[PDB]
Write a protein that binds this ligand. Sequence first.
Ligand SMILES: COc1ccccc1-c1cccc(C(=O)O)c1
Ligand SMILES: [Cl-]
Length: 242
Amino acid sequence: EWQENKSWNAHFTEHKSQGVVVLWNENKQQGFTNNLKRANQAFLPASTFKIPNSLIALDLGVVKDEHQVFKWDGQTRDIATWNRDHNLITAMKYSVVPVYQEFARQIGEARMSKMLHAFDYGNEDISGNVDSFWLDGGIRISATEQISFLRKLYHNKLHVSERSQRIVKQAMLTEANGDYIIRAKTGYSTRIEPKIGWWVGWVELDDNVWFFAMNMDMPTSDGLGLRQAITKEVLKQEKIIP
Ligand SMILES: COc1ccccc1-c1cccc(C(=O)O)c1
Ligand SMILES: [Cl-]
């Protein structure tokens, strides 16, 4: 069942923005969103693709574990945190595209395509360059499809090993305190219009889990912090977090 709550639009408009938040109550199997249409519109996944990419790299042995060091290639890039060595944990934390581009090359087109189909991930279309298709190729995924994929990951139901799924969920760890745990991944899509920011993941409570997926218009990098800020305002309004 699905319910549309347009009152959340206030959280976007008060920030002169537009977007969608989708929430899923796992216990009650009920979904909530401010915009049913946009919840089902398909966008480039951008760095949210690091979730499936990590799973595939681990399950194929391209990545041994979360400690393996991927050495900086020595090319100075405009994002300072990328000009350093990384492991899976820090590569996720800092959305280190060049590390995941190498993952994709080693995975290869054939295995990547098969695995995304097994994951039922978005439109499952890797058309484009194997090392950038999630940034400017043909792959697309909606906010509701992100939730479906994330629910499988949470339950270890994706068609990779349990170990691979546990490692990626560890690497998704974003926030934890005495009230909740958030495992999530941000995304920032600029190469194909409309430019958007993503935040997808879930909130673990003592007795329930709330999956979430949001995207919003992102004409400049100035508003990136609104991805988390708007989501949490919705979570607070729905009394999911204090
Ligand atoms: C394509 O990443 C960027 C492009 C332009 C400006 C900043 C970034 C950036 C770099 C790393 C993480 C994030 C982020 O999702 O918060 C954003
Ligand atoms: Cl953990």
